[PDB]
């Protein structure tokens, strides 16, 4: 997270850290949507241009963590993966269209003060909140500039009108993405950055006081560049795939 601040304890209890088992290394962010299922970006697992192809036995997730290197026993839980699922029309060649993946845990995790799932949006919630100028919250342990933090970072960012998003990049934007961040004339700054991929973009519904995951940190050009914006997987548009995956398996 660039230009963010330290998270409060239990502020983002759906945060998941994705680690490679051996050698141990922080790979990505992720989010908890049930006691067995974790949502993340497809490019965290499969990205052929970098010879990246992680399968279930290469990975672990850490849930309930607040420090980044410390092993917080009794406060965090480490879970193995039973299976991963990459969107079958995920497009790594051109633009990361449908940058989404599900991971099923080998055992269900017990919820606690530090572990609790985030909601997925329904149609009324998405239409109400996914508007230009409305702010969401991004969290991660990624780099602060294009150093690394000691505690999970958090930053609030406004959704940007889609015509401005398109004009900002040469990549062809699909309907499965939106972009967020401050415009050059707005004074405030902030962005996701390398290592924040796969983490959630969340918004709090004024209608029922619940936090909803609207996006997945997908890609951007640099971090926090004037006139450039971070792009996010449009979770609502892909919600039927998520339900299809969870319902069959």
């Amino acid at each position: 997270i660039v230009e963010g601040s330290d998270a409060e304890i239990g502020m983002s209890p759906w945060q998941v850290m994705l680690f490679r088992k051996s050698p141990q290394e922080l790979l990505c962010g992720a989010s908890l949507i049930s006691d067995r299922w974790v949502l993340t970006a497809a490019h965290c697992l499969l990205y052929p241009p970098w010879d990246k192809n992680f399968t279930e036995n290469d990975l672990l997730v850490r849930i309930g963590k607040h420090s980044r290197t410390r092993y917080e026993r009794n406060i965090e839980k480490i879970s193995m993966l039973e299976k991963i699922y990459i969107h079958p029309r995920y497009n790594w060649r051109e633009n990361l269209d449908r940058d989404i993946a599900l991971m099923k845990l080998k055992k269900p995790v017990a919820f606690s003060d530090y572990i609790h799932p985030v909601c997925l949006p329904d149609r009324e919630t998405a239409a109400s909140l996914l508007q230009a100028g409305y702010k969401g919250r991004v969290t991660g342990w990624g780099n602060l500039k294009e150093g690394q933090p000691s505690v999970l970072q958090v930053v609030n960012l406004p959704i940007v009108e889609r015509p401005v998003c398109k004009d900002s990049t040469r990549i062809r934007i699909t309907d499965n993405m939106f972009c967020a961040g401050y415009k050059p004339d707005e004074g405030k700054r902030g962005d996701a950055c390398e290592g924040d991929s796969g983490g959630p973009f969340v918004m709090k519904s004024p209608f029922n006081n619940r936090w909803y995951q609207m996006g997945i940190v997908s890609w951007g050009e640099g971090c926090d560049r004037d006139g450039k914006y971070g792009f996010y997987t449009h979770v609502f548009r892909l919600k039927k795939w998520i339900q299809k995956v969870i319902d069959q398996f």
């Binding site: 996914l130 508007q131 009108e161 309907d175 548009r237 039927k240």
Partner: peptide
């Protein structure tokens, strides 16, 4: 005021991240 992306269901070096 404007949607940041369509409210409907999916039918069917890219960045430095």
């Amino acid at each position: 005021g404007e949607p940041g992306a369509p409210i409907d269901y999916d039918e069917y070096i890219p960045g430095i991240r």
